[PDB]
Amino acid sequence: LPNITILATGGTIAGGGDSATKSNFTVGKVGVENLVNAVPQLKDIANVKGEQVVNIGSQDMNDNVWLTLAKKINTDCDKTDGFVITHGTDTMEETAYFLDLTVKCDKPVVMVGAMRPSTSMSADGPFNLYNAVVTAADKASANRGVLVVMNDTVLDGRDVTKTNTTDVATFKSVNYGPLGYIHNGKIDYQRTPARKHTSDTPFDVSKLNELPKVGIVYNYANASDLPAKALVDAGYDGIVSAGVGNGNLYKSVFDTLATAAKTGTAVVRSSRVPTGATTQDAEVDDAKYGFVASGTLNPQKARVLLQLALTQTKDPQQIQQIFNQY
Amino acid sequence: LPNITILATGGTIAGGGDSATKSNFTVGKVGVENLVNAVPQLKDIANVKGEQVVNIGSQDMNDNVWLTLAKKINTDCDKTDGFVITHGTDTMEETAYFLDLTVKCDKPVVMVGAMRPSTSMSADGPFNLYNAVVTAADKASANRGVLVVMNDTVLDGRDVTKTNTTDVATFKSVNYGPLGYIHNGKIDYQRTPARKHTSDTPFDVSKLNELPKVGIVYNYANASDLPAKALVDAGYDGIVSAGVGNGNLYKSVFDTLATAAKTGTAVVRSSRVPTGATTQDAEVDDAKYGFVASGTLNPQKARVLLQLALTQTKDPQQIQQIFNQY
Amino acid sequence: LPNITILATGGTIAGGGDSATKSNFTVGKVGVENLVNAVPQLKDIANVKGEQVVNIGSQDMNDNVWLTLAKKINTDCDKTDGFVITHGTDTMEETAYFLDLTVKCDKPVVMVGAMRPSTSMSADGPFNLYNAVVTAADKASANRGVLVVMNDTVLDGRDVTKTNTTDVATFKSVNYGPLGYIHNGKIDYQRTPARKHTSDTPFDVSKLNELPKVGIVYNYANASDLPAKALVDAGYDGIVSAGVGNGNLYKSVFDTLATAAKTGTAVVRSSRVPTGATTQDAEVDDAKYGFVASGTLNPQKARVLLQLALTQTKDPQQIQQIFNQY
Amino acid sequence: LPNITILATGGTIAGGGDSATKSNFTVGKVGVENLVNAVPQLKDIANVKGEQVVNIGSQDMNDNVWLTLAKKINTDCDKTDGFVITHGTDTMEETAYFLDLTVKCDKPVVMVGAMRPSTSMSADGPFNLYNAVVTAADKASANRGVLVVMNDTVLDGRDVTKTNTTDVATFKSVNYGPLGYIHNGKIDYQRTPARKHTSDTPFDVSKLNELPKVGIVYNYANASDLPAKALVDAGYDGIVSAGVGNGNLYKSVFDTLATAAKTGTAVVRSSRVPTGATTQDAEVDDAKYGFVASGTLNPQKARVLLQLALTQTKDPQQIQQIFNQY
Numbered sequence A, B, C, D: 001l002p003n004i005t006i007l008a009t010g011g012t013i014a015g016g017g018d019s020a021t022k023s024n025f026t027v028g029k030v031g032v033e034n035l036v037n038a039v040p041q042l043k044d045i046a047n048v049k050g051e052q053v054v055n056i057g058s059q060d061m062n063d064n065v066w067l068t069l070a071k072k073i074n075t076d077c078d079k080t081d082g083f084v085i086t087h088g089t090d091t092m093e094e095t096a097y098f099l100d101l102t103v104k105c106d107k108p109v110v111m112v113g114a115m116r117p118s119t120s121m122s123a124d125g126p127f128n129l130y131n132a133v134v135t136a137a138d139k140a141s142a143n144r145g146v147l148v149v150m151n152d153t154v155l156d157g158r159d160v161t162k163t164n165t166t167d168v169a170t171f172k173s174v175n176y177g178p179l180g181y182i183h184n185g186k187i188d189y190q191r192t193p194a195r196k197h198t199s200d201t202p203f204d205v206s207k208l209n210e211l212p213k214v215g216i217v218y219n220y221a222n223a224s225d226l227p228a229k230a231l232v233d234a235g236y237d238g239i240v241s242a243g244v245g246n247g248n249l250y251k252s253v254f255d256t257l258a259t260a261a262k263t264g265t266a267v268v269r270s271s272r273v274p275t276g277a278t279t280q281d282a283e284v285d286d287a288k289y290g291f292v293a294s295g296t297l298n299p300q301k302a303r304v305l306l307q308l309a310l311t312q313t314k315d316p317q318q319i320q321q322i323f324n325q326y
């Protein structure tokens, strides 16, 4: 059987409350094999090895945990057959993409969480975990970049996003679709991401101990520019604008970002719209202002790419070429 | 024939570029009957009357235009049979909800825009406009609150949102669905919003010349609290948190908002997740901190309701009862 | 506590296999009590009464079980506070609509199934059943027609349909959306079906012992007319055509049905297309041929309505008025 | 400029009515040139060559047109740079997949239709055609199998399907998603179909003049077996069952097909359910009965594959291996 290493980071997947009727869910609530003893069926498809990296609610996820997982994975690659990462569902789409860009291991790396606390009836965690490990042990899962396995579906780290606040079927690659579907331990792959990932990226955080400073400003009617200004005065390396429609910005916010763009601040235009790309040929002329169009990357994902892009350049033209290849 | 008044506000619906191959679209590009002469078929279903209120790109939409439309509509109610409002698509979901809460006229009020410039081939504006006026002239459209008509569909002002950056089929009530579908001028209504609207709301901006100050902060991994702090120090009346998952906040942002909540700042928790409600029984205990759960209202909509709620109260418990009824 | 009556008819909701890894699922596998003892939390929200009407796999569902459930519910109405009906998921959409047209009880009537056998991990049956009982005990569920509760959602029997073959979140009302969402025992209703149902229908099967004969023919490229012909020669009261696109038919099938239309056979045009209405103003001129357009009803629901319409008429013009009101 | 060959077969893309208010749409209404002169911008992106293969409404599409298009494309391959095929939207999904299996040309082969007659306002034909030609002229479109371009989207012929009866954004690849999105003449490809197609299939209709006989029976509550029986007695090579749920059949239909399976009739199990795969490990045991599971292929696509599979075998075990690779 394959040697599957499980890197735990916390999340609902490893926590409940007190009863099925009601529960006091917070961030976590249990160690590692607890999340191995509960699903005794795993022992049938793999040799699982656990290790608690940290144990928080993804809502508090941050650069350090990211950098750690990245290094941890790069280091253990040769010693194991595939990795499974338990994680909260709130920022799972953010961590998955980061790892997708930094992991240099091409053996399966599957992320998995749970939308219901283990204490609830019909909790999805146990089946999600099973399937995740099944995917990880599957030879065919290799070379597809970081994956996310939820509700019998295999989703790529780039397009995946949480589309619903409570639904167990929340996760979907809203622009390009899933890569495969799972049935009784069997996976039918019919897709694989085109953009370069993992071992094929220039990014390598092996020696980094911290990442650039990137913030996200939001756009709406009568929007205030203070948040934008705040991040500027506070000296931030880059800023992702969650624009309205196709990457548009409210006057105020536009000016502030237009100026900061001069000062030498990396500005990427993304959109609050859940689906579709922020194209370069629209209302705004990024060429003149130095803005970068995020494409199909949403605000929180465009950030991930801006940080890494900044670890290697500050030229809007370069950063933009990056946003067109990863 | 019914007397349909058209209140123009600009938007792509009234603008193009230069050619079909390429165009220099900005915010607007044409007056009022231009948007009446182009679709000569209107004269067959109604007596259209135009009036340019303003002419901007919804990306710059703001409180004043809102307050104006509100007053304009309340005033003209008795003189016309229904209203049609041309508007940009970028913040259409924001203006529609505001009017839904303030218009005291129960005669049809339909909003409509266009995802393609009139200069492009297969431009959707002309058909959207037609259908909008058809809906407005339809007796059955009355008493359903403010509507939005795009791609042969009739959507309510509350649930409607832009789900795609370029698709002509972008607008969808993502939580509860459309109210009716249009076919050859005929509408099949099978739904009507349950929450109280228009004439049944306590809100009345007749005498207001400005609205409270509400800003939106965004949540992601390693989120910064500066934007939140900025809006606080700048003395804002309320703040809507675009949280992760079910209304959760990143540590930093949570503290800042938790404190400001004491100071007397109205804090509502919404989510960046495009679908689903931000419930009151989750991780965070709003009772202790004074936060209000937005429900199915997204960030930019929860703002609209916070502003109006503030024009009448600052008690979290009251504001919350409002978020459960409108 | 409410007195909720549970009428069981079988389905996966009441059956598994042998183990979590593998199971030998067929049609059923357990009585009534079992589906009450498994969820001991029910006792806290209601006074449940069981009764096994039948116990098959919905794939074998038929007119008799329908007539029975209808009669059973009508008779029991005054004795209980609400009904829950465990059912298979394959034809649940068909049964749900039938009851929606024939039940003359306006107290809560909720249908519920499960996509995963009770033997699997993360089975969805126990939570569905819970929620279905919460729904049936809720005063606000009355007068909304027959409901279907699956995956924390309350769907009407007319629009609901199975959109996926294996997904637990398979049931959706694809044209008009859900009526409400369930959350920690609480239901947020924001919709209600406009079409007349239950107590407001002319249909009453009290004295019927059998229903008319309606068959469904399918349309594709190079389609054969033999199935259509067979149902004709076999003397069928009506025929629903699962056409391509907007109710279109392949030449062959068209002639056969066009002819049988004269003979006195009730012909309804529906579509194989999952979403949208089959309209009257399209390619085909139903007026000349005597065809009836199904509207948003899919083939299997267009049948339910044709059968009941036939128990009261055979005039295309009247049958069509029926398809426009129910 | 690329030499793009346009093979026309009719459909709405080439027909209207009389006016914008009303039209008498039937099947077609115009030659080839017209669908080139209407869009004078084509001349700037390609050297278009036309040819009218046939001119019907896809509802009447059939094996002959298929065999012809296949042969026509194979023969012309070396003479041109890419093909565009104007087609009706009703059975476009069926034709698209057939070509996907039989075309041995790997240069761009794009299909395209229109949901609105050229006479209506905002007709979608002209922009679809434009984009289809852009797609066919794009070097990156090669080797992706037969494509379908609608509403600014590039869909593969295997997964594509008509999800709505009237919506211009009706075509979607419901299981695996689009391959790319078109934007201002530019295409962002991020996917490509994994299943073998065109030049990598064993199927070659070069010498065939007709295809096997496959029919589709439908499943619902109280279903009749007569249509199944009819296709049997009529001596049909194969039968696709549009089952309920995960390929399940109603008792009656089951026996009939179970028996015909022995007789030597190719029986494939598909589902009426719009999304998801019909799996082999479910209720029914295909191994014992000789049935073949369709996978994600819907009924009308399961037919296309069964016909071609039959041109090379009749062994259930082999036919099944075919459904698992194409």
Ligand SMILES: N[C@@H](CC(=O)O)C(=O)O
Pocket (backbone or CB within 6 Å): A010, A011, A012, A013, A026, A027, A056, A057, A058, A059, A087, A088, A089, A090, A091, A113, A114, A115, A116, B245, B248, B283
């Ligand atoms: N608060 C939890 C939510 C979940 O995982 O379901 C988390 O983000 O880890």
Ligand SMILES: N[C@@H](CC(=O)O)C(=O)O
Pocket (backbone or CB within 6 Å): A245, A248, A283, B010, B011, B012, B013, B026, B027, B056, B057, B058, B059, B087, B088, B089, B090, B091, B113, B114, B115, B116
């Ligand atoms: N920039 C335009 C976009 C559109 O209407 O299509 C607006 O928001 O008005």
Ligand SMILES: N[C@@H](CC(=O)O)C(=O)O
Pocket (backbone or CB within 6 Å): C010, C011, C012, C013, C026, C027, C056, C057, C058, C059, C087, C088, C089, C090, C091, C113, C114, C115, C116, D245, D248, D283
């Ligand atoms: N074949 C079973 C499966 C299920 O219940 O989900 C039925 O339809 O009853």
Ligand SMILES: N[C@@H](CC(=O)O)C(=O)O
Pocket (backbone or CB within 6 Å): C245, C248, C283, D010, D011, D012, D013, D026, D027, D056, D057, D058, D059, D087, D088, D089, D090, D091, D113, D114, D115, D116
């Ligand atoms: N009935 C026509 C309609 C269309 O083309 O869209 C066809 O399928 O060809």
